[PDB]
Amino acid sequence: RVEPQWTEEARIEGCKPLTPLNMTRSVKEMKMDRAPLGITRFFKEVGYRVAVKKGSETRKNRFVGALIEPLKRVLERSHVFGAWQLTSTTPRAVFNIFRSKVDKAPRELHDHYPGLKRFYEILADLWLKRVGRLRRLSEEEMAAAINRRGTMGYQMENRGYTLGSYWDSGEWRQDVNTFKQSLLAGTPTHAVYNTTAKIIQYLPADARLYELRVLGGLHKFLEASDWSVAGQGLYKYGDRVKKAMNATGAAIAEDIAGWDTKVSKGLLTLEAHMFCRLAEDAEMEKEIHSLYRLYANPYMVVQREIEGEVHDVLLRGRGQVSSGRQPTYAANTITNFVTTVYGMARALDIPEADWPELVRSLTDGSGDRRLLVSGDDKVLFLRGDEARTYSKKAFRYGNDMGLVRKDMGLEQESEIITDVREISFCSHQYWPVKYGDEVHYMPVRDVGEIMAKASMSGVYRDDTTQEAWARVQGFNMLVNYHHIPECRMLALAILSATRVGLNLKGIAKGWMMDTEWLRDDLGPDTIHALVTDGRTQGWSQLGYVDYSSRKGLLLTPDKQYKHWRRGLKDTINSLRVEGGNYKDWMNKMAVF
């Protein structure tokens, strides 16, 4: 049907264009048994196979699901609970979703690249003074970050055991090394992204290792900058927000709808060029620029159903951001920060001569302008009069680049936030909680979502791997939500109904970062050392949210709520295995 046609990529002065590489080698590895059908709008098709693969995986946890069963009435009536009921998605839906979310052409033609280039450079200059050059990741740094439970792709489905399994075999070593030769020469292998739906776009197991080896060092600057929250956990997000409000007073927190599909190849060029000025050696400079030649103009495969014939459809795009690659989070955060500050300076009449200082003040954390970035999520903190000017003028600079704000008019003025408790960052709001003599702001979300992710899971041994997965969520719920009464009561029930001495740290190694507090000997002072650095101690000093705020996103202490609390004891015992080493009631650690 429709055949794709798009505007030519604009070239940017002082930048190296990300020219496409010869991808004839990688398309060999897919084997389409037919010719294109051309039903896509942005993505040009190359061919379709027939019923080569399907997409399957998700069960409710017996331990968590039984503890929150008495609560299922209130959670569904007043909260976002049960909104994750989605069977293994049929290939028709994965196509209509791919056509209505990713089949969009980014805006690659706009005159904001000159200003955006200098902001990328000014950030690159500050980075080199205070952190240094981007050092490649060694073999030990990769292993700590790799997702051990990952599929290696159809392209290496034939090779053998399937990611952690092949990290121990040792076959990954020359994989990454053979890919350096393939990419810089321009004939890369295994460079077609795979598609999964639950649209995540993932690559084979190696090259991920190449990306992590070359672009995993971006983590250092984000940790060292007051505009990023890399490394720290949710329990520290709130006090960061409260610090920025006290200096500014007005906050603008806007989302971009489908950020991954709205990044242009030009932004991807200004990115590489910034990371080239950060590379350690000249060889690394070629490695970053050659990798972004594959990052831009990608190739991928998607399925469809078309009333009978499940197909395997290869497609190619331009300049879009890959959902499943590891170092994407770092790049997204940097390129968001840059695009946002550029529009801010353009709206506040900040002359270019003051731009080198603006980036330093924002990275150091001084001045009437503070910012907080984390992927597609940002909160801009500004002074009262500066925030009103940002509201009436700044959206024109975002819309030129193709970044349209979600649930808002194209030229609608930004909403100025006054109550710090109305600031949405990393899907959570932040409410004040009393810790002894100190008050800290702690992540609050709809309780329904919280409990839904603790119950809805892929397993490796069903039970006793499911039990371990239950208390691992129990520990997470106690560390990050001990201030919500419902979540501590549950977390302590989960910890009481699950066995002492399971492979907690060993299981869920890929997803779980900061696993230091995932141990059976955890106690109240463990959370204290995270929240207030140990300056507090005791269950009696671990505070809760205000009573007046125990509503809305959080549960109300009504008759149904009391009934669930009453039944928690019995349910814990109904879950306990005969003669298991079960910790004492962790529920005796909250006053009834």
Added chain:
Amino acid sequence: RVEPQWTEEARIEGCKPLTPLNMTRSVKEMKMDRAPLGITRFFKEVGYRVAVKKGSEGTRKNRFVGALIEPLKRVLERSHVFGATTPRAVFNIFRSKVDKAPRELHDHYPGLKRFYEILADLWLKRVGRLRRLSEEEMAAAINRRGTMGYQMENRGYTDLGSYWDSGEWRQDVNTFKQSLLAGTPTHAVYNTTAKKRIIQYLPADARLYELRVLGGLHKFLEASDWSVAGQGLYKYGDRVKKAMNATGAAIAEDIAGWDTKVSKGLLTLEAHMFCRLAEDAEMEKEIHSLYRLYANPYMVVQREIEGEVHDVLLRGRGQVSSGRQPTYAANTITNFVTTVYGMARALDIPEADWPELVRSLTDGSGDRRLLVSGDDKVLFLRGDEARTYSKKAFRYGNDMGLVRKDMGLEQESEIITDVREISFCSHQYWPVKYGDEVHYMPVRDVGEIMAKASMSYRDDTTQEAWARVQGFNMLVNYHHIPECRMLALAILSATRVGLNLKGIAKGWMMDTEWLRDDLGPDTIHALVTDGRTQGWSQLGYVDYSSRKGLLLTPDKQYKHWRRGLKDTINSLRVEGGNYKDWMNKMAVF
């Protein structure tokens, strides 16, 4: 006066001789001017400098710990080993402790080569080849607070840890790698430190080199049931008790001054075994070249003759150095092999049966088990194979130059039966009940325990952190000793919450994961009984009837100390500091 080493270095069939290296490069870095005096008997003198420097140090009593255990000083001195530098006196120590010629001539080398090889063969099949240590791996093991040596003291470098981060060691170690690999090695003279026991340390450049090649020896010792490398003192007891239950009779003999009694011939079987275990052929040259400096070494020691202090250069042969990363690993394997060889020769174990002995011992199967840690061992045998070993085996040791401490040269070994009287790593191991489980936990003279916590002035927030670190250690390893738990709890109550426990004093301490302010009873449970127990009320003690001798008795002075522990804690408490709630409420008053 005379220097007649003339012990005619032995030759071993099938081994590469440890030929001496050209040390003309290293002696220049010593800047020696005067002529030898030749007071040494084994070590050959080359020259001495004049009073360039001396030695200064501070062994100070911790204000925090010392004040807590002061009411106990009366009884600790009456009944225990409590209360226990001059360049002149450093020399006369080194003359009576190190200035001894090792026995290099004996015909036990053929049999010892095979045992070195057959263990080298099992290790290749069960572990693999010896892999060099990466730079990260080197960091996790370096002692950050160490001197870099007199040769590099002039550079301005104040301590090893700070200039380990500079990265300039990489150029230092590679350039030094060329010298050692093909003659005229640089920075190759060992330097000496007093320890009131002469420590022999090598410059920071070489320390990193030996760690890069021979640091991976740790792994092989972790895979074998005859080492305790890696595991903490809280796991030593149960390892001893497991061996007793299969054998019944134990023999624990110490060698007096083991470092000074190893011969170069043993160092040749050492190097060659590690050469048979090296990953590549280049590593083989690296291990052998390093053992060319290890054998026939050079070193400088101070002395005071007629009121003149001198830096006296000397040279020996085939002795083992204290300050090396691979020395503990080597000394353990070397101790293991010389021991098993003697046991095979005394129990009449055919040479055709030796490959199974070394496997049974590594796997931990049979009526024959061994426990090795540096110069320390306990040989576990059956009741009647222990009677044969006691009467016949010392002759094989005495031939190799390894004479037993405080025993007759040919005196019969003493066969031990009571598990609680076995001595491994300066500790005995008494049975303690952890709920329904019983585990053997390390005991020792309490006088020696509490002394080390006191390091026996001035204060510093590192002196406070050093007391808290000693208090967490005392609580994990000696909570069964009642007095040590009370002291450990008193230390934890009088030390502030939130110091840099893990950061400072970390270099000597290994496995510091439980050094944390949120420690609690189940932290010790997860160590002793893998978490199968829980709660203070399940953290057991030694038998009351055994609260005597090595341990304190609950007499009037002990109770008096207990009463006064409350006020002493407070008297130490800084105003307005976050002090962990009385960790002493966790014991019965």
